[PDB]
Amino acid sequence: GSVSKWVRLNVGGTYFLTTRQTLCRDPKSFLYRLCQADPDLDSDKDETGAYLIDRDPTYFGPVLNYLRHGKLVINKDLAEEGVLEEAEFYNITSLIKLVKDKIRERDSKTSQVPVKHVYRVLQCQEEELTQMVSTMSDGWKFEQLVSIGSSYNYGNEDQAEFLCVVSKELHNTPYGTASEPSEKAKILQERGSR
Amino acid sequence: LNNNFLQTLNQAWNDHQTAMVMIRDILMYMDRVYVQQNNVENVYNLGLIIFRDQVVRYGCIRDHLRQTLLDMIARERKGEVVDRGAIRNACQMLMILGLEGRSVYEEDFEAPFLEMSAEFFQMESQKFLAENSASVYIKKVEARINEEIERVMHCLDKSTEEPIVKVVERELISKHMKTIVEMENSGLVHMLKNGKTEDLGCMYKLFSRVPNGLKTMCECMSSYLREQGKALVSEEGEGKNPVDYIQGLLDLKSRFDRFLLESFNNDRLFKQTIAGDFEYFLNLN
Amino acid sequence: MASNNTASIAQARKLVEQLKMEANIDRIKVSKAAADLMAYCEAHAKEDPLLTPVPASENPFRE
Amino acid sequence: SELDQLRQEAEQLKNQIRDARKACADATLSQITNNIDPVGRIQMRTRRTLRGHLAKIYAMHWGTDSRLLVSASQDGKLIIWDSYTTNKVHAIPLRSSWVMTCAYAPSGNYVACGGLDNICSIYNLKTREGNVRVSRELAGHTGYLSCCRFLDDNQIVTSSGDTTCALWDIETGQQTTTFTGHTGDVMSLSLAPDTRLFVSGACDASAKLWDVREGMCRQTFTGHESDINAICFFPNGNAFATGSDDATCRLFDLRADQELMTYSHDNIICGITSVSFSKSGRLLLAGYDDFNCNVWDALKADRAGVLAGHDNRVSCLGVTDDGMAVATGSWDSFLKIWN
């Protein structure tokens, strides 16, 4: 790469005519090395004089978009996973991390489809009640309110008078985990069970 | 062995690095994922470590390198033009291969170069005291300090600056104090009476580089000052003239204050060690 | 060398490094430090309501 | 290969430290001066039986006005108690289950909660709407959170599993400065009121006092043989009390670089699970696995009194940050304000 600043690639058989500057945005990129001459690189097509990147152009689109203008938007019909897997092949770490966040955000929104709902119980006296009902944490839902009779501060105005169940949908937005091998966590779990 | 060992090892290193770069380009990946998860070092670091454990810390290569390097730098010290840049590459090996510390450089070339410099300075001191006067000896040690800076910026590493310079300070000056004061018309006391404050300043910068040198200056200046003062205040013949008794002390005062300003730039100890003597002689006036 | 218990040189090096400055940190004897602490506590004993019970109109847990 | 040097040097370094520490060791005048300023009996009554929680309370953190008390229960709820009225300013449901730590910001605008999710949830306690919208779910923990504390309202240090107590930038969610060196899980975390050192108590029974700016461990205090439950820094930024599974609590002084004093009683073999300093620092409130807590005279090494009136372990203590009374967050689902 020492000629034709608008260097022409043949990514998946698609002629991408892209400037050196965009590719040189992140030198951590496989393509940044193609922007410059190096002797090991002997991957070429002699039918168009354009070098070969035997990866599909269907997911190369969003990758090139991010790399050109520091941000990508994946289509609502194109797999985020495919963009990710095409992403590490050029080794742009920040892009991969951001796409991981996007993927896990999406999967959290589709873990809703399995019957997975996080439930919580709050306790409230009559006065404060609506205050949590109104200013309750955004992204949850009210599910049930039960009045339980009291003799400590008889009936109304007792703290233990009302029980309010709330719930949201199970999510794995930054990530989900099934176990932590750390022993002390298990010890505390056993202690707090009874 | 029909070409000097430093050049061949340097060329082998350069070939190793030029092949290693492209292996880095290949294995950009496992360096990003397998390394930090498995508590292993960086792939470039691992390859440098293997190059270390197979070539440079292996016996014969290390010893032949050290012998060739010491002979070649001694020859350069004697005035022969040699490839200092190959010595640069050697020194950057003995740095970057060492990882965090200074260990391998200390073992291979840093310490033996320090020792050869010390031995060279030893015979330098004996030689320049056996044939030449004190002025040539001091000019030689100062010029060798300058050449230490030259070898730091052209032939050695910046991190090697403070050891070898220290080597010049301890070897040439520390135990060669009295002889610098003595030897006729080349010493400190002899340029004291001449009034040539420039050579006094030369002594001053030379000994400010070595700890406790200012104390030896204080001892010498005070010794000469007290001989002059005792020759002045004491009564000789019928009796010393008021020119040589009252105001002669003032002449000595002006002379030594001129030294204090024009040679030593008015350090506290230097002004005190002469002011006390002036006080002592004034009570004898 | 990462085959030496997976590059234990770094962890041992930082262990030694951390062990270094502990000595260079000041060493001021136990009795004097204890004296400092009792001086602070007794001086502040009057301003600790736990040691100085206070009226019901000036504490928020009987007002 | 070279490790043979590194260990022996370390071996002698500790030796030197011992030689230094034993040199610094003098008679503690506090136990000597048990005649001066006798505290006598201390009797306190609980005046706020805040019973909104219905599961074991794990941590609290009094506000910087000693009015808004954030207390977490492992069910996944935070209660910002209004301690002056026994009212809940906020009941906040957490997506994380089994929260153990709640850190109250110096501004009362953010709150921090860490559970068995490896996620440090940072909740904006107030928005333009008024609902409690989460500000940032800090990710990047390689283990479980055990305690966290704010430095600024955009910088936060946490104590996590797998030898990690890194310092995070809240905005990015990235741990700016990863502190490493512990040989075990890091449970406790106490901040100096100097906001320059944080002392991490790990499972290796050693309290590593760390600088907060870059990676450098100020000291490695070690008097315990058991993992550290809680650390309470003195209000002078010069010493800290440390509890562990052993019935011994220990006071470690920076200036002496050694255990200034010990706090153990044959009467109580239960491990001191929570330590807290009074406003003066004269008294030391110790919570116990025993179903009540006690108070030592921290400069007499004797039980200044007993706070009883629970039926399950007092897993955390809190003291108003001007000193007025003590919250005892027990596993009985009650918080009691002993005044």
> Rounded to whole angstroms, how far apart are CA atoms A190 and D111?
27
Number of Cα atoms under 13 Å in the Cβ half of residue B151: 25
Residue pair B56/B76 in contact (Cβ under 8 Å)? The answer is no
Closest alpha carbon to B46 in B35, B55, B56: B35
Sign of CA dihedral B12, B15, B16, B17: positive
Chain B residues within an 8 Å CB radius of A32: none
Neighbours of B109 (CB within 10 A): 23
B26/chain C closest Cα distance in angstroms: 21
Q: What angle do CA A189, A141, A113 make, to 5 degrees?
A: 80
User: Can you read off the two tokens belonging to residue D300?
Assistant: 């007499």
Q: Which residue of B has its CA nearest to C6?
A: B40
Residue C54: CATH number of its domain: 4.10.260.10
The answer to whether the beta carbons of residues D283 and D298 sit under 8 Å apart is yes
- 3-state SS class at A120: strand
What count of Cα atoms within 13 Å lies in the side-chain half-sphere of residue A120?
28
C-alpha to C-alpha distance for B147 and B84, rounded to whole angstroms:
14
Close Cβ partners of B224 (under 8 Å, ≥ 6 residues apart): B189, B192
Helices B111-130 and B134-154: angle between axes, nearest 10 degrees: 160
- Please name which of B40, D199, B32, D97 lies closest in space to residue A180, comparing C-alpha atoms: D97
**How many alpha carbons fall within 13 Å on the CB side of residue A97?**
9
Please judge whether D281 and C37 are an interchain contact, meaning their C-beta atoms are less than 8 angstroms apart.
yes
Across the interface, do B49 and C2 touch by the CB < 8 Å criterion? yes
CA distance linking residue D66 with residue D318, whole number of Å? 10
How close B97 comes to chain C (CA, Å)? 11
The residue segments making up the domain with residue C41 are 4-63
DSSP readout, chain C? Answer: -TTTTTTHHHHHHHHHHHHHHHHHS----HHHHHHHHHHHHHHTSTT-TTTS---TTSSTTT-
- Six token digits for residue D219: 């000291």
Q: Sort residue C5 into left (φ over 0), alpha (ψ -120 to 50) or beta.
A: left
The answer to whether the beta carbons of residues A163 and A123 sit under 8 Å apart is: yes
Q: Which of A192, C16, C28 is nearest to D5 (CA)?
A: C16
Q: In what order do the strands lie in the sheet with D207-211?
A: D186-191, D197-202, D207-211, D217-221
Nearest to C3 by CA among B52, D60, A143: B52
B27 three-class SS: coil
* Nearest-angstrom CA–CA distance, B119 and A103: 69
Residue D309: other Cβ atoms inside 10 A: 18
In whole angstroms, give the CA distance from residue D251 to residue D263: 8
B39: chain C residues, CB-CB within 8 Å: 6-7
What was the resolution (in A) of this experimentally determined structure? Answer: 3.9
- Contact between C2 and B99 using a beta-carbon 8 Å cutoff: no
Cα separation, A138 vs A115, in Å, equals 21
Cα separations (Å) of A36 from A3, A52, B107?
9, 15, 40
Q: How far apart are CA B70 and CA B109, in angstroms?
A: 8
Tell me the chain A residues in contact with residue B29 when contact means C-beta distances shorter than 8 Å. 88, 91
Distances (CA, A) of B98 to B93, B110, C3, D229, D295: 8, 13, 16, 41, 55
DSSP-based three-state secondary structure for A128: helix
* Cβ-Cβ contacts under 8 Å, D253 against chain C: 30, 33
Query: Number of structural domains, chain C?
Result: 1
Tokens of D307: 């706070």
Chain-centroid distance, C-alpha D39: 25
Contact D318, D103 (CB under 8 A): no
The 10 Å CB-count burial string (b at 16+, else e) for C25-61 is: eebbebbebbebbbebbbebbeebbbbeeeeeeeebb
DSSP B92-126: HHHHHTTTTSSHHHIIIIIHHHHHHHHHHHHHHHH
Neighbouring C-beta atoms of residue B172, cutoff 10 Å: 25
Decide: D171 and D154 in contact? Cβ < 8 Å: yes
Residues B134 and B183: their CA atoms lie apart, in Å, by: 7
Q: For residue B139, what is the enclosing H or E element?
A: helix B134-154
Strand intervals (E) in A22-160:
44-45, 50-53, 117-124, 141-147
* Residues D143 and D137: beta-carbon distance below 8 Å: no
Q: With 0-12 CB in 10 A as exposed, 13-18 as middle and 19+ as buried, what is B134?
A: buried
Alpha-carbon distances of D90 from B75, D68, D326, rounded to whole Å: 83, 10, 21
Tokens of A94: 């920040």
Distance CA D115, CA D98 (A): 5
User: Distance from B51 to chain C by nearest Cα, in Å?
Assistant: 11
- Give the HSE-up count for residue B31: Cα atoms under 13 Å, Cβ half-sphere: 15
Task: Count up the domains in chain D and report the number.
Answer: 1
| Structural domain for D91, as ranges | 1-339
CA angle at residue D243 from D242 to D249, to 5 degrees? 85
Q: For residue D216, give both structure tokens.
A: 């450098």
- Is residue B18 packed enough to be buried (19+ CB in 10 Å), middle (13-18) or exposed (0-12)? exposed
Output the six-digit token pair for A170.
């199970």
Q: For residues D181 and D173, give the distance between their C-alpha atoms in angstroms, rounded to a whole number.
A: 22
Q: Is D126 on the interface with A (CB under 8 A)?
A: no
Q: Output the domain CATH number for residue D33.
A: 2.130.10.10
> What is the DSSP secondary structure assignment for residue B78, as one 8-state letter?
T
User: Given an 8 Å threshold on Cβ–Cβ distance, is B41 in contact with C7?
Assistant: yes
CB C55 within 8 A of CB D43: no
- Give me the residues paired with residue D81 across strands: D69, D88
CA A18 → CA A3, A68, A94, A114, B265, distances in Å? 13, 9, 21, 43, 67
Q: Which chain D residue shows the shortest CA-CA distance from A142?
A: D93
SS3 A82: helix
Phi/psi of residue D198, nearest 5 degrees: -125, 130
Chain C nearest-CA distance from B29, in A, is 19
Q: What is the 3 state secondary structure string of chain D?
A: CCHHHHHHHHHHHHHHHHHHHHHHCCCCHHHHCCCCCCCCCCCCCEEEEECCCCCCEEEEEECCCCCEEEEEECCCEEEEEECCCCEEEEEEECCCCCEEEEEECCCCCEEEEEECCCCEEEEECCCCCCCCEEEEEECCCCCCCCEEEECCCCEEEEEECCCECCEEECCCCEEEECCCCCCCCEEEEEECCCCCEEEEEECCCCEEEEECCCCCEEEEECCCCCCEEEEEECCCCCEEEEEECCCCEEEEECCCCEEEEEECECCECCCEEEEEECCCCCEEEEEECCCCEEEEECCCCEEEEEECCCCCCEEEEEECCCCCCEEEEECCCCEEEEC
Report how far residue A31's alpha carbon sits from residue D203's, in angstroms, rounded to the nearest whole number.
Answer: 46
Q: Find, among D179, C11, A89, D175, the residue nearest to B41 by Cα.
A: C11
CA proximity to C40, closest of D237, D230, D301: D237
Technique behind this structure?
cryo-EM
Tokens standing for residue D126: 């107030």
Which two three-digit tokens encode residue D144?
């479980």
Q: Across the interface, do D118 and A177 touch by the CB < 8 Å criterion?
A: yes
Which residues lie across from D295 on neighbouring strands? D285, D305
Q: How many CA atoms lie within 13 A of B34 on its CB side?
A: 6
Task: Report the alpha-carbon distance of residue A72 to residue A65 in Å, rounded.
Answer: 6
D133-138 β-sheet, strand order: D99-104, D110-115, D120-124, D133-138
Give the count of alpha carbons within 13 A of D295, CB side only. 27
Choose among B146, A21, A182: nearest CA to D162.
Answer: A182
